[PDB]
Amino acid sequence: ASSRAQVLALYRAMLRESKRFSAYNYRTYAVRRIRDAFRENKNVKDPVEIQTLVNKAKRDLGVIRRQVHIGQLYS
Amino acid sequence: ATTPLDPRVLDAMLPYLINYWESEAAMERARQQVASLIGADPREIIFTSGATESNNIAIKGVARFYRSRKKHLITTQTEHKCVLDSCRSLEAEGFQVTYLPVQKSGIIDLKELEAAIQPDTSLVSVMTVNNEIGVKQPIAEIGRICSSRKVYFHTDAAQAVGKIPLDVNDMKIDLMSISGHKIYGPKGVGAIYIRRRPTVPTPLVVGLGAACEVAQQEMEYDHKRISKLSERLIQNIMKSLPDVVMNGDPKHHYPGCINLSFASSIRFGIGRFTTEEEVDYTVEKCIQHVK
Amino acid sequence: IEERVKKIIGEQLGVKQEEVTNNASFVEDLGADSLDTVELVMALEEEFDTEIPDEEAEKITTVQAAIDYIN
Ligand SMILES: *P(=O)(O)OCC(C)(C)[C@@H](O)C(=O)NCCC(=O)NCCSC(=O)CCCCCCCCCCC
Ligand SMILES: *Cc1c(COP(=O)(O)O)cnc(C)c1O
């Protein structure tokens, strides 16, 4: 499993990181995409499902971090 | 008509942009990604430089392969400029090519199509989607006609892949053209789908595959998003000026392409990454155009 | 105002300035969930550029806890 405070810290982390996108469209798409995604899947009740969506969330957080860091490499 | 690179796809290609086996595995992954988006087999996907190359392989490919038996090809008058250039070349080589007009609705007339088929037709090539005004062509019905008539059916989906659902066998596709940078992937990459009976730099092919996977995962969300912003644009102009009209059959619009007329016409493009601020800008900068 | 915090929370939870009291809990008075929480505590530094940590923020359920933490 992955509790509840885990996914709350996760969501906080993707918001925080996505706010560091240098490009405007990428950052608004990122925070709108994340907000809509978590809010839509808020009342999911299946564990094998939930851990799948937080697995995907982690992957995506991986890519977001990599490309905001790359974007900061050139400034 | 290009799109920005999706940071996820860039994340996919970057490992392959930094070092130059793993190539075969990356390419096989990419081609099953494409196939899974369009409902094909992985064996039926071939990578190209883009939809221009795909269209030339399909159209000049079938045209020249069957020259000894068939001489007539059918296309539409509003295809991509390079499709029309290719067909002009085929005409100079001796082929006869029917250029079908599209009605005011923006859709081709099926009766005109099947009336045009001759004993020596090898190929029908019809855009999946009217890029100019924003309608979907009746691809499935055309595939039915061509199947009954024993005609090769090719379609240019460069502007359709990822925006509307596509399935090769349902629509009876024989050949399909796909472009990478029309779906937030990289320029220089494309695909052709060739139906089977029973060269290209790998960073670009894994880019195309990544773009295809992202599209397959994002189709519904982007659909109702682009739809939301389109309704904001149209309704916001209509409120400040009630004389404007939206062209094209309303029952067959697809998200991303809006054509409005004044009393001339202007075309708007809404896609993934388009913000409400941009829609709110070009709604007034166009309204400022008080002719 | 000087402690104009009710503007940020009112703008984040979509409540008028009349409903945002001082003894208002975000979850049971302003009607919020745990995603609106992280969004609002994230939006406070949009006004003050602070850094309220993960550990010391779970108990800022009241609006006056927000004005008191800022102060
Ligand atoms: P609150 O009510 O206390 O919230 C706690 C909740 C209710 C959320 C929790 O207790 C719960 O029940 N969760 C159920 C399932 C869940 O929360 N899953 C979380 C994962 S959701 C997800 O998959 C997010 C996907 C985000 C993709 C964004 C893509 C960004 C693109 C970047 C490139 C530009
Ligand atoms: C852009 C486009 C093409 C060309 O695609 P490339 O990958 O740039 O070669 C072909 N057909 C249509 C309908 C297009 O919009």
Residue numbers in the entry:
A (entry chain B): 3 to 77
B (entry chain A): 65 to 84, 97 to 274, 295 to 359, 404 to 431
C (entry chain C): 3 to 73
Structure paper excerpt:
Biogenesis involves the de novo synthesis of a Fe/S cluster on the scaffold protein ISCU, trafficking of the cluster via transient association to various targeting factors, and finally cluster insertion into specific recipient apoproteins. A critical initial step in Fe/S cluster synthesis is the supply of sulfur by the cysteine desulfurase NFS1. Here, we report crystal and solution structures of human NFS1 in association with ISD11-ACP, ISCU, FDX2, and FXN, together forming the ‘core ISC complex’. We show that eukaryote-specific ISD11 binds to NFS1 distal from the desulfurase active site and does not directly participate in catalysis.
